Amino acid sequence: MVKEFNTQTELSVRLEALWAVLSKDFITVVPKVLPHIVKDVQLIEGDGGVGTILIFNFLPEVSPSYQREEITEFDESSHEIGLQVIEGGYLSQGLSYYKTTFKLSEIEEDKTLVNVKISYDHDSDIEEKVTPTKTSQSTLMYLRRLERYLS
Ligand SMILES: C/C(=C\CNc1ncnc2[nH]cnc12)CO
Ligand SMILES: C/C(=C\CNc1ncnc2[nH]cnc12)CO
Numbered sequence: 121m122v123k124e125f126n127t128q129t130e131l132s133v134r135l136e137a138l139w140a141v142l143s144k145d146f147i148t149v150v151p152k153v154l155p156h157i158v159k160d161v162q163l164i165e166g167d168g169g170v171g172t173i174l175i176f177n178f179l180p181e182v183s184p185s186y187q188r189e190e191i192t193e194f195d196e197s198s199h200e201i202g203l204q205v206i207e208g209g210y211l212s213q214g215l216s217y218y219k220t221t222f223k224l225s226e227i228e229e230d231k232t233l234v235n236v237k238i239s240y241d242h243d244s245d246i247e248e249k250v251t252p253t254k255t256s257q258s259t260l261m262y263l264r265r266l267e268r269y270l271s
Contacts, residue, residue, distance in 0.1 A: 154265070
């Protein structure tokens with residue numbers, strides 16, 4: 121049954137700048153900020169909203185070499201976006217379910233809170249590399265790299 125992991129980070133960026141890159145402008149940015157993992161991102165169906173499907177192609181050394189994710193929620197007024205891994209990536213490493221929801225809120229003009237909810241499951245005992253204590257660390261690293269990209 122699906123379990124949850126929650127964490128958060130405060131970033132020294134304006135909410136609207138972080139929202140744009142997180143929710144809309146990430147196609148060219150992901151490979152630039154994660155050049156040690158992500159080669160490119162392809163938008164393959166949809167126009168950026170719910171149902172949009174993305175392929176992340178990873179570096180040649182990486183197995184699986186890609187991950188397919190779908191935007192499963194998108195709310196512009198509450199600044200929430202959710203992405204579910206639907207093929208490859210963690211699903212090829214022992215997970216049966218993996219979704220990441222980001223919600224932004226303004227702390228001050230140049231401080232933005234990002235709440236991160238990870239939902240996941242696995243049918244058997246799993247390796248550390250797919251524990252959400254570990255997967256969340258990768259996600260927080262990406263968020264802090266966006267902050268740096270924007271600064
Ligand atoms: C395109 C976006 C996020 C991309 N996907 C992920 N971003 C950060 N950590 C993850 N873990 C699994 N999938 C992800 C939002 O900018
Ligand atoms: C299973 C793999 C990567 C997990 N996916 C991600 N890992 C780290 N950052 C990301 N941004 C978007 N997707 C990811 C490939 O080794």
